Design a protein around this ligand. Structure first.
Ligand code: NA
Lengths: 218, 209
């Protein structure tokens, strides 16, 4: 088969600046008809892929003039000028010279915005859930940048381990931030043997870790 | 306006077969090829094969030669992909695409599992000049769950987090929204939760406590 390689899994870009995304092939994609059979696709989170470039350098209908493609036959570049916050997504190359058609592994475009500390919120378990025998304590980290953020749980100021789970959103297409949730899961009986629940957040935008907490019963 | 409408999500048992469809509209079905692409969760794109609906001819990626069978029905403007001897490695979103790369189907999620369908429980994340509030959607199977706020009228400031797989083998997710603190006494906030696989529809009012 023809192997398509995308050397960078992600590339950071400040809005307004230009960026280049590379792709390489293990065989020349040039056909004797003169065309080079390489596509560039964009895939936004939760959506189907969409074509940007066809036959290595042709802009697809409806794609902005800020996107362009070029290459040698074995090495290709998708160039985006004046990168917008809305350009977040994964960019893939694909060869269609020979069967089987093959794709590159994708390059995510990351928007480099100003560093922003998360807004931290803590939610105790609802009385509705406590009745069922389980307790979920949720810590929300809202609209922060960069993506990297550590969350530590403390119960009666004792550091927790093995009882939490996190989920992070895709980078926002408008404000270029991320949000994260951490959920601490205990049984109702164990939840009721403790008083103080806290989530402690470590992030590049914070000089020292931030703590949000509550006292059970308040 | 061209459309490739794919069949809905499938929860199918290991060792069985599943057949997904791709219905074309807005153009002459028999004049263009149909390709099938696989995308594992959080992974890249893989090419499965292609069919010429106007001749019945096919080509497959060798990795899918045993597993997949591509067919097309000229009368109903539909292409079909059947996957046999299903395993957890077949759990993925499958897309159909018309030759040329411009027109794609919306994808069909296939989950291969022997586990039973289970609807979620929905709990409020009650709010205490911005307030955060939300809904915790716990213990469901399979994916997906969709969440809207105020029947789609509330979209600004909403974050619906990707689901996580718990140690129990059941999924859970949260959806939050930030709103003006001054609205907590005048505006009703409702999270509309839908888990299609179990026909669960919950509209939870989230009140300040
Ligand atoms: Na086959």
């Amino acid at each position: 088969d023809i192997v398509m390689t995308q050397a960078a899994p992600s590339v950071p870009v400040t809005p307004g600046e230009s960026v280049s995304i590379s792709c390489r092939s293990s065989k020349s994609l040039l056909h004797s008809n003169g065309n080079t059979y390489l596509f560039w696709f964009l895939q936004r989170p939760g959506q189907s892929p969409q074509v940007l470039i066809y036959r290595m350098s042709n802009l697809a209908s409806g794609v902005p003039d800020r996107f362009s493609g070029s290459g040698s036959g074995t090495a290709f570049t998708l160039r985006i000028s004046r990168v917008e916050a809305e350009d977040v997504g994964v960019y893939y190359c694909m060869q269609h010279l020979e069967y089987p058609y093959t794709f590159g592994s994708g390059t995510r475009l990351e928007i480099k915005r100003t560093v922003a500390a998360p807004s931290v919120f803590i939610f105790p378990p609802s009385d509705e859930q406590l009745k069922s025998g389980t307790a979920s304590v949720v810590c929300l980290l809202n609209n922060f940048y960069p993506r990297e953020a550590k969350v530590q749980w403390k119960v009666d100021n004792a550091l927790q381990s093995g009882n939490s789970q996190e989920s992070v959103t895709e980078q926002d297409s408008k404000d270029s931030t991320y949000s994260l949730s951490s959920t601490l899961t205990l049984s109702k009986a164990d939840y009721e043997k403790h008083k103080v629940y806290a989530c402690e957040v470590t992030h590049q935008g914070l000089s020292s870790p931030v703590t949000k907490s509550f006292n059970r019963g308040e | 306006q061209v459309q490739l409408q794919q069949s809905g999500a499938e929860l199918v048992r290991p060792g069985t077969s599943v057949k997904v469809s791709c219905k074309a509209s807005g153009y002459a079905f028999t004049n263009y090829l149909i390709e099938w692409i696989k995308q594992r969760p959080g992974q890249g794109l893989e090419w499965i094969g292609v069919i010429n609906p106007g001749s019945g001819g096919t080509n497959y990626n060798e990795k899918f030669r045993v597993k997949a069978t591509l067919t097309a029905d000229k009368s109903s403007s539909t292409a079909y992909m059947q996957l046999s001897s299903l395993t957890s490695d077949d759990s993925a979103v499958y897309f159909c695409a018309r030759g040329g790369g411009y027109y794609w189907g919306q994808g069909t999620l296939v989950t291969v599992s022997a586990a039973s369908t289970k609807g979620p429980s929905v709990f409020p994340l009650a709010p205490s000049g911005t307030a955060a509030l939300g809904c915790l959607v716990k213990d469901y199977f399979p994916e997906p769950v969709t969440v809207s706020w105020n029947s789609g009228a509330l979209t600004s400031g909403v974050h619906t987090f990707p689901a996580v797989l718990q140690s129990s083998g059941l999924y859970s997710l949260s959806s939050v929204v930030t709103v003006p603190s001054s609205s907590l006494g005048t505006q009703t906030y409702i999270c509309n939760v839908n888990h299609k696989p179990s026909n669960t529809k919950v509209d939870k009012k989230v009140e300040p406590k």
